[PDB]
Design a protein around this ligand. Structure first.
Ligand code: NAD
Ligand code: ZGJ
Ligand code: NA
Ligand code: NA
Lengths: 493, 493, 493, 493
């Protein structure tokens, strides 16, 4: 509910390396475009391989035995994370406003959702810093055996544009809690907010080199991180397509540890006994949240025969009702899509939907004639074999599906190489308990959707990812287990 | 459906101490009665304080730093518990016959349920023996910190008669897996099967004095254990009143650790939307299982008012057809109560129910003319103020209660000093999820009853207990935690 | 290093109940005496049983199903704890000054040690609030099984006078992190600091009733808590003597869960290969810390033959060197003892030491003639059979012991009903590894002493206590495990 | 000292698929050679991609939702793994004889070490099967949240020849305990013992297609598994170079999860204050154990300069007396290398060491004239730049290095792309504690070597691996975590 800053000052537009604001070696820059107007907000440094090298070198120095970062109490890593949270909260209006400027998401979402979870993810992992225990192990023989939960080391972190601050949090927070150093490559489309955050990292007191931020393109900077021979781990969030190239690059370089957080085509499933009104609203936001550009979006809405006409009819009405407009307006629900390419990609899929024989129920075209706005779009009578049913559209397009039986809707929902998330809406206990086992997805929701918090481990089955972020389970990926085994004069229980 | 052994060889009738069969210092015996016939089976050693002191010395010595049992690999404690389970399997028919002889439960229970769980509990904890890890802890300062999950030491174990072999296993399996030594005091009513198990403990290869079994009366042998200045821990399963005393003896003697597993007045709650046929059957067996002598018996049946009369009629029907008879007949559903005293107590409670204004619906008197059999009894119209509603009857009496609202039946189910168990029957997701929170009991079942296995932590809220047994959580009471904190020259993460 | 407030305003001197400052029902008060001058600082409310009843009633209302405290996110319990930390830090000079006024400990200790650990313990458990997970359990049959880690409920907490704020932290922080409500009875000798803290609890935003503070006497208020029929748990820190009465009272009342943190006579053990200078200094502070009034104080210093004369000689010199005086002076190392009784108790033990044939090497008498100061006192040639060797003196008296062999010093160190802590000083690996297994104490230190932090579980073997505080292990005592078990239509791995 | 079986019956020479013995689709075989004699033993089926596809279909079907293996109690997966261990015990002499026949290791190794660990690993993981718990998570909002520790699914398992039975067990035991299905590709050099184990898997009672064993070449059969679009996970133990490829095949195919257990150049480090006799013996056996063909072989021996010459002379002495000969002679300490190719490779490295300027001290050529035997070889004067210092020789060659300072030898021990293991020999507490932190390897030993058991997480830093095997930590790679988040009507703590 506070009011935003409509023309924020953007002091930070350079590379953040070893706590110093820095131009690319090449001195090159590249523009970021405000998607609500189509106009150039400003220019940021265009980092390439040579800048990744400087960043990796600094993060390596910060990770070396006896560095300040390695020697500080685990609890001091906690306090630093906690202070960062406090700084984010202090500058919450600014940060959420900058997010809306650069990303285009509504300011209500940006302030009340994104920034809130950013603050929480930093606070949450602040708490884990000194509670991530190893084991003492009653092994055979005259031994004292235990494990250390050491950091894995220099982590390369690559994130997308859909939730810039949140995706940065998800990566930085657990990596820092566990004592790693970071070289992070943020999306080309949304470089600004992450840079203001790096100023807060400096203000918070993190040693130089522990966090380094690189703005630039994916195939240049990013491939440089994935391919780098002195990066111990890459944590990648992005398209399934690019995921394939990251795991390859790891095998091609130095066998760096890999976590992948990838695409999805997540099914919401409404049984006939569900609270209709609630299921229609949840499935509606399941897809339309963040202008359809959420990775775990409910992008296939499956609906039982007995209730499909009513469900369809109310869903259409909700799409038509959703406020589209300037995201700085408090009641805007859908901002523009992120850029020209994403915008045309989505209109292309709308066109494709119709060519394939899917029934267009509303929208289906540009909204207005400035920026990259698209009318909320719903498709009826979609079938499993259609391109719009199999591929990640990543936009405000809701395809509806009809089903009769439980066995059928399980098979159809799981018949995909994706497996990021899934949801069921039902009043019945046994049905809900069965769906939680049957659906092949990293997160299964019951009578809700998109409830991903700092506490909840999150990741794909199959080609939606490899490994888990958030919660206690999110720490494993940032941990290199060492087993210490010591000969003792006598063992006793 | 295997065949029982009737009137079999019973060599073990003495105290098991430091792996040698011994009578009490005073040379006394006491009789044990077959509840089916009413006839004395044999006499058994009558342990008192001087015998307990003997057993405590044996336990203390087997637990001394450097002993075989302390120095042994944790995995070998595993292999021993597993050998024990193999031996119980080999002699399964003999033990199931012996329990039925001495306690009175049907051979179909004794063989298929009791003995199966006994094997499973030695087997389950055999596996925990070498997996119960301490922690490495990234504390402040220039320190390596870790914890050892050491055994507490000499553990006094006092069990009841209702599941003589199961209760012995619930005690011995976790205690030995964590490497303690045991002085066990078996119930006076059911001494025989626990002594035969002791012969297998010896055959398995447990060092002398690790397990020490004592037969005797509670006020002498039990109280010597609870009051002993060299018992490190008491684990007690029995009556709430005796539990009060056990806790007082620990405070009056040596501040030994105390786990208490006490009585219940556990409610089964049947909502309007439940599967009627299933709910009737489940709540019938919740009470009458093991002749109403189960600690977690569903000894109050609360039923929603719209389905009350239907549930009532079906419940009386099912009580009228329960097969009462000789427990060696493979199809007897109900054996005799365990001794004269228990039999008369339950008859007293039937009478009491009638004088309080509760409607007797069936049974309500002795069955037959030899042994200690009671007809399955059901009461209707029961109120919360009645003594049969408040007190643990511990026999074949099923009181039925009527409720209208959710909020009313939670208050009434929880309005008791007890909290061992509870159960709900419903098809509704939301209602099930609310009751699992709202009911104050250590185990809440949904659409089932009495499902307590080696994996499931079991114990009481309020005066139904202190601590938990079974599962990983059952290991905590048998652990003394030692923190070890060592100056190191330089700490790195 | 900041300067203290020498005459702090003491606005809070009443009972804290349901967020309201409150006189005892009786309107009675009792004085607290400044131990450095012998003069009455002021009067606080004298709570008795009737005031405990009002406190318990309020904490019960705050714990009821659907209360604000029970419904708030676990993470909001974290934030509240974290804000409390922030408030303690804000008012750190005041609080540490008030502690020195009422307790008499040096302001350097009070500020740099006590207050620091108070801030950390609140911050540490703030982090645990939303990370204390239960289990999902792959049990036998067609079941979904999991455990809830519910709060145990209304916790009675009774603490001593030696570290008023710290002992309050150790109790409040984990109890609140896990969602319990509290009725706390603080020591009669040191009521003031805990009351200022309760104002911070209110300022932080904790719901009314969640924390209640009672000032008053042990046998009146305190026994009332231990004996209370609606208190679910008592956590007691105090004398072993009173511990016995708490566990009794629990058995005598409602079987409330009991944790006991009791006395000690902890041995430090210096082997011949230890860094002499360092061992002399560590063993010196091991006892003399907090004027000898630390519970885990190294109150028996065992020293190897080859090095005893040198060790003795340097230890004596350190005792004589230790600055005694006004605790508000920055370089004071030893303040006065807490009150007249403790003061004479210690001088009594000094007298007793000499009567028993122990060799007085320095001090042995009052220091000056105002307040309750005692000269640092060391005894040579102490033997295991002397009263000064067996009993908790709780003052600035260091007895030295000589030993030859490792087996011997193990037996002598463990030959006591106490077992709170222990320490060894040695350069040798195998020796250190052996001592960590052999010594029967809840904390074993290697080449240091008194390193107890929020991370490190802490408690007695034998009659030094029952259960553990601090670290992850500190949460178990404040947890009531509930096992939920649900019948499902089909189980799959 | 039990007696081996020479030239025994070997019925199993084909593929094990869906519990039926089958040849390859192409009907081809390949030979296996006895490294002792040099003579062909028998021929074995040559699996290729079409055979793998067959095996993947069998694994996929046994893993389908609702199958016997999915629906089975976790505890029964336990009991099956345990039956398997009983059967391996029954046929222990036959298997130990068969491993010695096919691989060449001494029967004293094969019987007493290898087979013992195999039994222990099936036994250890049998116990984990029903104890691998997920979590209940007190997340934000009106939600019950929990995790399921589901199996990842079809697991491709590729093992080497150096410990044919041990490596098979390290793979199958954890994977089956967590309820996966397996397609295993056994080494071409050592196919026989793994097929006999398959006969016991069938006798134990594992459902069809749960375990599927394939004999064949790496580039065909191995690569079909790593590249298959329906294998969910690859676990690979072998060479670093092949590990690179495995990681690339996963990225190029279906983003299957990858665990890699790769090569080493693990250093043993002997400080001046170490037990000389013990250190010589330990570092000698660290290298020559299993004929120098142990992944974690102590293949660099760094020795403090003050004790260098003494250590050198004693080490050559111990190399000169190692009993080289027929591995059925019970007292042979060293069998032959495994095949022609390995034999020539190691001879090449001996020669290479001489041309680089390293002093040959003993052996350094073929032993005898039949089979593939090499004399124990030691080099002195070795430098870090030499190829024998950098490359994994994987045979009976012990390079000796000289160091002065602590800081120097950590840098040099860590200066490698490898990090499987390391070890220190010292009596000093502080020095041991520093090395356990400072060395970059997944296992650090202190005053021992090669102590890897079922309890101890094992794996590489850097290019020695990704992830860990053995212990509780080894279960994580075989787990797909599912978060389940359910709307509830009211949340209470
Ligand atoms: N293990 C630990 O964590 C730890 C820490 C600090 C102090 N201590 C111990 O505390 C003791 C010193 O403090 P203390 O003298 O105040 O001990 P204490 O036993 O006299 O009193 C402790 C607290 O309990 C109260 N109390 C006294 N009698 C009571 C009764 N009958 N019922 C209920 N409460 C009663 C007191 O008022 C006080 O608040 C020493 O033995 C010391 O070793 C232990
Ligand atoms: C608030 O402090 C305590 C409360 C109870 C028990 C022990 C301590 C304690 C004593 N100590 C001390 C105090 C003084 C010394 C010391 C030793 C040698 C020379 C000077 C001071 C060491 C530890 C600590 N702590 C706790 C926090 C960790 C840091 N240190
Ligand atoms: Na932009
Ligand atoms: Na005072």
């Amino acid at each position: 509910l506070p009011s935003p800053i409509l023309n924020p000052d953007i002091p930070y537009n350079q590379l953040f390396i070893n706590n110093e604001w820095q131009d690319a070696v090449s001195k090159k820059t590249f523009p970021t475009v405000n998607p609500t107007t189509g106009e150039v907000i400003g220019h940021v440094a265009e980092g390439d391989r040579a800048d990744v090298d400087r960043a990796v070198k600094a993060a390596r120095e910060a990770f070396r035995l006896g560095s300040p970062w390695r020697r500080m109490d685990a609890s001091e890593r906690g306090r630093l994370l906690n202070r960062l949270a406090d700084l984010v909260e202090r500058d919450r209006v600014y940060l959420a406003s900058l997010e809306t400027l650069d990303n285009g998401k509504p300011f209500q979402e940006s302030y009340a959702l994104d920034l809130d979870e950013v603050i929480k993810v930093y606070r949450y992992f602040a708490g884990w810093a000194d509670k991530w225990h190893g084991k003492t192990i009653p092994m055979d023989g005259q031994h004292f055996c235990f494990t250390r939960h050491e950091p894995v080391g220099v982590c390369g972190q690559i994130i997308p544009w859909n939730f810039p601050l949140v995706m940065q949090g998800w990566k930085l927070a657990p990596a820092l809690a566990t004592g790693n150093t970071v070289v992070m490559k943020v999306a080309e489309q949304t470089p600004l907010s992450a840079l203001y955050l790096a100023s807060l990292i400096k203000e918070a007191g993190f040693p130089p080199g522990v966090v380094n931020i690189i703005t630039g393109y994916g195939p240049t900077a990013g491939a440089a991180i994935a391919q780098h021979m002195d990066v111990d781990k890459v944590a990648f969030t992005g398209s399934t397509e690019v995921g394939h190239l990251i795991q390859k690059a790891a095998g091609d370089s130095n066998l760096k540890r890999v976590t992948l957080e990838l695409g999805g085509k997540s099914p919401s499933i409404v049984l006939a006994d569900a609270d209709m009104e609630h299921a229609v609203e949840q499935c509606h936001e399941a897809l339309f949240f963040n202008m359809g550009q959420c990775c775990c979006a409910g992008s296939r809405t499956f609906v039982e025969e007995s209730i499909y006409n009513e469900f369809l009819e109310r869903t259409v009405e909700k799409a038509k009702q959703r406020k589209v407009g300037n995201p700085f307006e408090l009641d805007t629900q859908q901002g523009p899509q992120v850029d020209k390419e994403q915008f045309e990609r989505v209109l292309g899929y709308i066109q494709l939907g119709q060519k394939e024989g899917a029934k267009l129920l509303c929208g289906g075209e540009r909204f207005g004639e400035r920026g990259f706005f698209i009318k909320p779009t719903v498709f009826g009578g979609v079938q499993d074999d259609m391109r719009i049913a199999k591929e990640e559209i990543f936009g405000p397009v809701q395809p509806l599906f009809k089903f009769k039986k439980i066995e059928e809707v399980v098979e159809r929902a799981n018949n995909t190489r994706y497996g990021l998330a899934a949801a069921v809406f039902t009043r019945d206990l046994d049905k809900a308990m069965y769906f939680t086992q049957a659906l092949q997805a990293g997160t299964v929701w019951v009578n809700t959707y998109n409830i991903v918090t700092c506490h909840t481990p999150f990741g794909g089955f199959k080609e939606s990812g490899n490994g888990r972020e958030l919660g206690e389970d999110g720490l494993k990926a940032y941990t290199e287990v060492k087993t210490v085994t010591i000969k003792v004069p006598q063992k006793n229980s």
